Amino acid sequence: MKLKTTLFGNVYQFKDVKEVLAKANELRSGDVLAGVAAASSQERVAAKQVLSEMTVADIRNNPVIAYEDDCVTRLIQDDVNETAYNQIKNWSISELREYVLSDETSVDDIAFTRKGLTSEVVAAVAKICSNADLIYGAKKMPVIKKANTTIGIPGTFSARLQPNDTRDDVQSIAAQIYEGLSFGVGDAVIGVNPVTDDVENLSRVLDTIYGVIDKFNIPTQGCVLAHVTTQIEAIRRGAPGGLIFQSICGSEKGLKEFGVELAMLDEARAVGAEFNRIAGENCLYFETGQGSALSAGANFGADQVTMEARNYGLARHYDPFIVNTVVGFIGPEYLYNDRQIIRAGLEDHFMGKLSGISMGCDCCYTNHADADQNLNENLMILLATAGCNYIMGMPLGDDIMLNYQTTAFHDTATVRQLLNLRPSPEFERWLESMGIMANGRLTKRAGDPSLFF
Amino acid sequence: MKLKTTLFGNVYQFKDVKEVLAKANELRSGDVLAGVAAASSQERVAAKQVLSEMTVADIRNNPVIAYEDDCVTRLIQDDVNETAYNQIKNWSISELREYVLSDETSVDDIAFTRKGLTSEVVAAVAKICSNADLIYGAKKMPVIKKANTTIGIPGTFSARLQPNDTRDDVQSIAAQIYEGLSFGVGDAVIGVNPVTDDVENLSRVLDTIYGVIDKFNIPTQGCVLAHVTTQIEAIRRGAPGGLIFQSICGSEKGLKEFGVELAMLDEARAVGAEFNRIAGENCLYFETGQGSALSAGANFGADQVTMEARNYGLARHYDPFIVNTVVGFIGPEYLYNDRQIIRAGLEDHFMGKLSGISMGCDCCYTNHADADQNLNENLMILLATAGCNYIMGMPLGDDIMLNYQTTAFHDTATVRQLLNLRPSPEFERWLESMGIMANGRLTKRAGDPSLFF
Amino acid sequence: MKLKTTLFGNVYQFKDVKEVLAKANELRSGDVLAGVAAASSQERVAAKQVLSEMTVADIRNNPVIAYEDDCVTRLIQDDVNETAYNQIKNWSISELREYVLSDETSVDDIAFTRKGLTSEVVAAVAKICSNADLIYGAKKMPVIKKANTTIGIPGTFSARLQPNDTRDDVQSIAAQIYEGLSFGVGDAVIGVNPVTDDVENLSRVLDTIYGVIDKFNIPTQGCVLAHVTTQIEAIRRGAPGGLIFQSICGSEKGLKEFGVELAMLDEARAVGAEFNRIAGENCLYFETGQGSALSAGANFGADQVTMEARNYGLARHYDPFIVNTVVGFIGPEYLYNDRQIIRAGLEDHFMGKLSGISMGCDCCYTNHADADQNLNENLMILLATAGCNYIMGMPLGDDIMLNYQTTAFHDTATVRQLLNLRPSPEFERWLESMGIMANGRLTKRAGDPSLFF
Amino acid sequence: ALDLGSAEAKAWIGVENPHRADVLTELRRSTVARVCTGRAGPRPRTQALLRFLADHSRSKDTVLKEVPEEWVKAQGLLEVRSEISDKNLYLTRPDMGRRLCAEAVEALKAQCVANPDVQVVISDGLSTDAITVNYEEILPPLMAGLKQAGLKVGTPFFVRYGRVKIEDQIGEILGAKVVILLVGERPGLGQSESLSCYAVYSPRMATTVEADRTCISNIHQGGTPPVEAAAVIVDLAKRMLEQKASGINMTR
Numbered sequence A, B, C: 001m002k003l004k005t006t007l008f009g010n011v012y013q014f015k016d017v018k019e020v021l022a023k024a025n026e027l028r029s030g031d032v033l034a035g036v037a038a039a040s041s042q043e044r045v046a047a048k049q050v051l052s053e054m055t056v057a058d059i060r061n062n063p064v065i066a067y068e069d070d071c072v073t074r075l076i077q078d079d080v081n082e083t084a085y086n087q088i089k090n091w092s093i094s095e096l097r098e099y100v101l102s103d104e105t106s107v108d109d110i111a112f113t114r115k116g117l118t119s120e121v122v123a124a125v126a127k128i129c130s131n132a133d134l135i136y137g138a139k140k141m142p143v144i145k146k147a148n149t150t151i152g153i154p155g156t157f158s159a160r161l162q163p164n165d166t167r168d169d170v171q172s173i174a175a176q177i178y179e180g181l182s183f184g185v186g187d188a189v190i191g192v193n194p195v196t197d198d199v200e201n202l203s204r205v206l207d208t209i210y211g212v213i214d215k216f217n218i219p220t221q222g223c224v225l226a227h228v229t230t231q232i233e234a235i236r237r238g239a240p241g242g243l244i245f246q247s248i249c250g251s252e253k254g255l256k257e258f259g260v261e262l263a264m265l266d267e268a269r270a271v272g273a274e275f276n277r278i279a280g281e282n283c284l285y286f287e288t289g290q291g292s293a294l295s296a297g298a299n300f301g302a303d304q305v306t307m308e309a310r311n312y313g314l315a316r317h318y319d320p321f322i323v324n325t326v327v328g329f330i331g332p333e334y335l336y337n338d339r340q341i342i343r344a345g346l347e348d349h350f351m352g353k354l355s356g357i358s359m360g361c362d363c364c365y366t367n368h369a370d371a372d373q374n375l376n377e378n379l380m381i382l383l384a385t386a387g388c389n390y391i392m393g394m395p396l397g398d399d400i401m402l403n404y405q406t407t408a409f410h411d412t413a414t415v416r417q418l419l420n421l422r423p424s425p426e427f428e429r430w431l432e433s434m435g436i437m438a439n440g441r442l443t444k445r446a447g448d449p450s451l452f453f
Numbered sequence D: 001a002l003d004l005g006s007a008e009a010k011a012w013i014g015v016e017n018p019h020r021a022d023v024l025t026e027l028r029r030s031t032v033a034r035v036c037t038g039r040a041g042p043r044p045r046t047q048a049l050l051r052f053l054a055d056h057s058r059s060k061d062t063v064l065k066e067v068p069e070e071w072v073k074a075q076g077l078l079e080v081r082s083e084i085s086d087k088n089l090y091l092t093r094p095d096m097g098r099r100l101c102a103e104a105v106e107a108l109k110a111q112c113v114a115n116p117d118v119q120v121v122i123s124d125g126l127s128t129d130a131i132t133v134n135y136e137e138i139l140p141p142l143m144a145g146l147k148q149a150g151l152k153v154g155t156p157f158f159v160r161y162g163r164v165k166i167e168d169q170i171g172e173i174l175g176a177k178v179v180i181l182l183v184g185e186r187p188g189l190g191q192s193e194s195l196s197c198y199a200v201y202s203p204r205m206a207t208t209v210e211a212d213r214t215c216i217s218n219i220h221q222g223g224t225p226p227v228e229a230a231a232v233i234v235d236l237a238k239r240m241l242e243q244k245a246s247g248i249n250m251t252r
C-alpha cells in the first residue's frame, strides 16, 4: 500500500494507516486536542486521497488497536464474514464509497457486503464522503429492528421519550411522559436516566413508566439508563424489563473506564430473553458518541471518528433494538460548534447504518459549546432525510437534570409532518385510537397531556 | 391437577400428563404401534377434555422426558420467557386454544405469548384443535425469515428445489434445477440429498448448484443435506456455503441415534457466520417428522405428535431460515393413510408456527403407505391456505433416489396461481427478469428448462 | 406602542421600530458591520419580545424608509389589500407567527392574510422564528407559477441550469447545458450570466440556449442575465425571449445603484407579452440577497433581513415566474460562516414564500467566506424540505466566471431521489421520453451529456 | 408586560383549548420541566420560544463567570489551580484541567495535612454558581461530619479550572485514603447551581479508572439539598474506608 501522495507538486507523506484515517477527517476540535488532525486543508485532502486509494484489505488488516491487545478489536475481527471480505478485499475505499452510493447497489447487495467490513473500513468510507454523501448513502441503507414497536422502516421516524427528573420524582417523570405521548413521542422507548443507581429506585422509576404503558395499552418499551449491572439486578428482582441499556466505548480500555465487561452484555441478552416484556427479538439499547474514547485516554492515537465506528462494530455483535450517538453531549473540546456537530451527526448515523445497526441520533449540544437550539433543528431535519431511526424528545428539549439541550417533542411532530413520515406502525395505531394522530398529523386535541385524564 | 373426567356417566381416569397427551391425539397408526393410543373414541374425547382443563403450568411442569435426563428438555425449558410464562401459567389449554384462534389476538400478542410456552404445551393446543382450527390458527401466526430470499410473508409461498440423483450425477442434478427454476421453484433453497457423504462429493454438488446460481445471478441459496459435520468440513475447505442442514429428533436419545450433538449446531451457526454466502441473518435448515423418535426407541412412552413439537422447541433455539416436517416420509406404521397424513401435516405446521419457527412441509407419502399423489395435492393446498412457508419441488414429484413421492414443480405454480400467492419477493423479481413470471403467473415461455440455454 | 421590556430585572429600551427589527435578528456579520446589531444575547431576546408584542399596525405604519422618499416603500404600501390588513392590524407579531405555523391555518387562509402584510411585517415574523419554524412555515406556504414549466407544486423540485463561461464561449455554454440536462437540471430556466453586456452577444448566447431547447423540444425557458435594457433590446430585435431578468434592491437608492427604474420592469412585462416564447402567464426572473442594500449605502440604518424582505414586496408587484436569493454570493462581511448562511437562506426563503412569490435559493458561498461545499449541501437539503422552489445547477457547482461555489447538477438529483420529489411535470415528461428519468430517478444512462449526441 | 425570567413566565400554561385545565396546572406544578406550553401546529408557542431564548442567553453567561479570588480567600480556602491559565483554555483543554500546575503540587505538600483519611477538594469545574450558591450549606456539615464520630480529616482547598480526574493526582500527592471532589457540573438551560461529588478510594493516576469513582450528582435546592447531601457524602466516606473500595467495587 501507499502512504504517500503528491498534491500540487508537493509530496504528502504519512506514517501509517492510523495517521491517514485521522487526518482525513473534516476539521474538529477533538482531533486537534488528540493531536492527530491535519495541519491544513491541503494535508487533509492529501490524506483523503491516500485513504481513498487504500484497499479494504489495507484498512481491515490495520485496526487502530491490535488484535492481541484489544477485546473489541477481537470481537470486530472475529465477526467478519470472510467470504464477503474476500470478495471486496482488493476494492479501494474510493470504489467502496461509490458502491455504497450507487443506485444500482440494492439494500440486499449492501446486506452481504457490510459483513466483509470492519469498523475501520466503515470509518474510512465516511471520511471521504461529503455531507450529502453521508445523508444519501445512509438513506439507502435502512436497518429495521423490532421490540414492541418496529423501528427503521423507510417512511417512518421514531422518538425516545426522555422524561428525566432531578430527583427521579415520579410525578415529574409521569408529567413528562403524558406530555411526550401527546406529541406522539415514545415509539422508540420511554427511557429515563436515573439520579440514583439503586434497585429500589430503578424499580420505582420502571413502575412509573409501565404504570402508564399498562393503563393505556401502549405499544412501546420502558428503560432505565443506569449501569447495566443494576438494571439486570433490578429485573432479576422482578422489575419490568423493557430495553436494557449500556453506554459503550470502542476499545477495551474504554470499556474498563465505563466499568463494562463484554460478559455483562452477554448476560444482558440472556436476562432479556428470560424476563423482558418484549414481543420482537431485539431488546438491547446502546448509546455512543465521539470523544468518549479520547476522554478515557483509550483512543491510542486514533481519531474519534474511527473510535466511534468501532462502537458500532461492537454494538452490531449484540443486535440491539436501538443505538444512538449522543452527538454533542460532552462539550466543545470534542465538537466545537454547529458545523462540527452537524458533520459528526451525519458521520455517526452513516457509519451506524453501514455497520448494520438500528442507528438514531440524540441531536444535542451543551451550553458551553458554540451552539444553540437552531443547530438541533438543523441537524434533526438533515438526519431525518437521511432515514435516522429516531431522536430524543423532552419538553422543549430542556433536560432539567442532564444539563443540556436535546430536541423537543414538538420537533418529532415537525419532522414527521414536514417530511410525511409516520411513527412506528404499532405506535401509530395507538396514537390514532387515542385520537392524538390522524393520517400522520397531530389532531387538534393533541399536544395536551390532559387528554390522558 | 385433575387427571379424570366423567363422560356419559362413565368415569375416565388417566395416569399422568403424558398419557393424557397421547390419548387426546386423533387416531393414527404410530400411536397404536407405540401402545399409547386411546382404546375408544369416548376415551379420546375424555382425554381431550381432561387436557383442555389442564393449565399451561400443568403441562409445562410435566415434560414427557425429565429435565436432568434430557438435553432437549433442558434447551426447551431454559429458553422460556418466564415473564410471559407467568402471565399464562394458570390458563387452561382450552383458554389458550381460544386465545390463539381469536381475531382479537394479534400477531404481536402471539409473539410475546409463545415465548411463555414449552413444546408440550404447543402439542396440547394442537391436540384439541380441529383441522380448520389448525389451518386458521397457523395462518394468523406468520413466521418470517431471511437468507438471500425472504420467506413467510403472508401472501407469498416458497418452494425447495430438490434435485436428487441416484449417483449424484451433476448433469442429472443440473437438469432438474433448470426444470425447477422454469416453474419458479427454488426460493426456499436448492437442496440436494447426496448419496455419498464425503467432502469431495459435497463440494462437487455445491459447485454444480452454485454454478447455476452464479451464472444467472439467482437470489437463493444452495444446500447439500449430508451430516452437519461433512457440510462444515466442506465449507471450511472452500466449498460455497448456503444453508446448513441437519435432521433433528425431540430427545437426547434420538439425537444420539442420528449421531448429532447440540454443539454441532452451535458450530454450524458460527461457520455460517464466517463462511456462508447469505445476505440475511438466517442460514440453518432442519427437517423433522412424526415417528422418528418412536423409531429410535427414544419417545419414552410419548406420542409422536408431542415428540414432533419438541423438535420445534429444539429448532427454535437456533433460529433457522427454514424448517419442514417430512410428513409421510417413513411409512404406514406411523401414519397409515390419506386422513392421518393430512392431519399430521396440519398438526406439524400449526405446532411449528406456534413455536415461532419458519415452518414448511414436505407433503409426501411412500409407496407402501395407503396413499397416492391426490393426497399430496389435497395437503399442499390445505397447507398453502394455512400459510405454509414452503413445500418441496421435484419433476412430477418423483424422487429417484429417496424412493417416495413429494410435490411436483407444477404444484407450486398451481398453488400460487390458485391462491394469488407470490414467490419470495427477491426471487419473484429474478423470475420476472428471466421472463418466467408476470404478475405472479407463469408466462407462456415458462415450464421450459431449455429457456436457460 | 411599547418600545421597552424588562428582562431578568434589566430594563431594555429601544429607540424605534427599526432598531427593534435590527436587533431582533440572529447574529450576523452584516448587522454588526451596519452598526445595527444587538450588543448582547439578552438584548437580542429583549428585542425579540418587544417585536413579538408589537402589532401588525405598528410595523406596517413604520416602514424603514419613508413613503414620500422611497418608491419601493410606495409600491409595497400601495399593494396592500386594506380589507385583509384591517382584519389583522391589531394582531401581535407573536400571534401572526403562531397563525402562520398553525396546522389549522390553510394555504387559502394565508393566501388572503398575506395580502394584508407589508415587507417589514414579513420580516418581523421571520425574526422571531426558529430554524424549524422557518422551514415548516415555508413548507405550508407553497407558491406556484407557470412559464413553459410549472414550478412550486408541493412534491416537486426545480433547478436553474447555470451554464456560465469566462468568454461567453458558445461551445462551453452548450457543454454545460448538455451536462445539466443529463442530470435533469433546467426546469426552472436555462440562464446564462454573460461577461459582455451587448445585444449581439446576448442574441448569440440566446441562440445557443434555444438551439438546444428547439432541437430536443425541451419544455423550459432560456434567459441571459444582462441588464434589463439589453435583454429588451435584444428581444425587440428578434432574439428568442424566455425569462426576462433583473437583480433588485429594497430601496430607491439601491435601485439607482443598480441602474434600474421601476418603469423598466413595466416595459419588461409588456415586452414579454408581445415577444416571449412562454406558454404560461409568468415570465419575469429576479435575484436578491442579504447585504446588497448595505453595500449600496441604501439600507438607511436598517438591517439586511428587513431590506431583503422589501425585495420580495417589490418582486411580488410584478408576479415573476421565479425569484431566488443568492444567499452567500457577496462575502463574509455580510454573512460570515456556515451558521449565518444557513440561517439567512431559511429566512430569505420563508420571507419570500410569505410574500407570495415563487421563491428559490442559490445555495452558495465564496472562497473568502468561512464556508465550504458541505455547507451548500446542508442548506440545499434543509431548503428542499422547506419546499424551496428551485436551486442552481453547475458542473460540481464550480462557476468559472462568477468565482463562487453553488450547487452541483448532482445535488438536484440527490435532493429529488432523497426526498421523493419530482421535477416540474412538463420537464419530467421530457426527461422520461429522453430516457434520462424513470419514476423520478436517474436512469443508468443519465448523467452522460453524450446521450444527446 | 411580562419579564421572561419571572415566576409568572415560568408558570405559564400555553395549551390552547385544554381537555382538563386543572390537570394541566397540577402537571405544571409537579415538574421543573417545560411542560404544558402548548403549540402552534407542531411548533412551540411564541412565549415558550422567547423564554427558552432568554434562559439560554443567561445560561451562556454562567459558563464563563468566575468566582472572585477574594471570595475563595474569604471562605478561608487555599486556592490552587490546574495547568489551565484561563476560562477559554479550560473549555478546550480537558487534559490540562486534569493536571495540577508545577506550583500547585508544591503548595499542596506545603500547606495541606499529610496522609489524611478523607480529603475534601472543591473546584469550580464547569459551573461557578454550583460552588458559590451551595458552599456554606454543604461544606460546614461535611467537615463537621467527618470529624464528629470521625477520623483524620484533610484540609479543604479550592482548585481553579479543575477536572474530575485531577483528584487522582491530589490523592497520590497527599497520600489520601479517600478523595472527595465537589465540582460544578455543566450548566443547564435554566439552572446553573447543580453540584456533583466525585469520590474515590486511594486513587492512582496510572491505574484508576472512572468506574472506580462514586458519583453524587444534582446537589442543590432543586435536587438533593446540600445539607442533606453532606450527610450522604460522610456516610459514603465511612463506607469507602470500611470496604477499602469505591465506585463499582463497592457492595450493595
Ligand code: B12
Residues within 6 Å of the ligand: A193, A194, A195, A196, A197, A225, A226, A227, A228, A245, A246, A247, A257, A258, A259, A292, A295, A329, A330, A401, A402, A403, D094, D125, D126, D162, D163, D164, D165, D183, D184, D185, D186, D194, D196, D210, D211, D212, D213, D214, D215, D216, D217, D218, D247
Ligand atoms: C457529561 C457526562 C458524561 C460523559 C463523560 C465524558 C466527559 N464529560 O468527558 C459521558 C457521555 C462520556 C458519560 C458516560 C457515562 N455516564 Co455520565 N454524565 C455526564 C454528565 C451529563 C456531566 C458530568 C459533569 O458535568 N461533570 C462535571 C465536569 C467538570 O467533570 P469532567 O472532568 O469535565 O468530566 C468527568 C465526569 O463527567 C466523569 N463522568 C461522567 N459521567 C460519569 C458517571 C460516573 C458513574 C462517574 C464515576 C464519572 C462520570 O467523566 C469525566 C472524567 O474525566 C452527568 C450529569 C450531570 N448533571 O452531572 C452524567 C452522569 C454523571 N453520568 C452517569 C452515568 C451512569 C454514566 C454512565 C455510567 C452511563 C451508563 N449507564 O453506563 C457512563 C459511564 C461513565 C464512566 N464511568 O466513565 C450518571 C451518574 C450516576 C451515578 N450517580 O453514579 C450521571 C449523573 C447522569 C445520570 N444518569 O443521571 N457521562
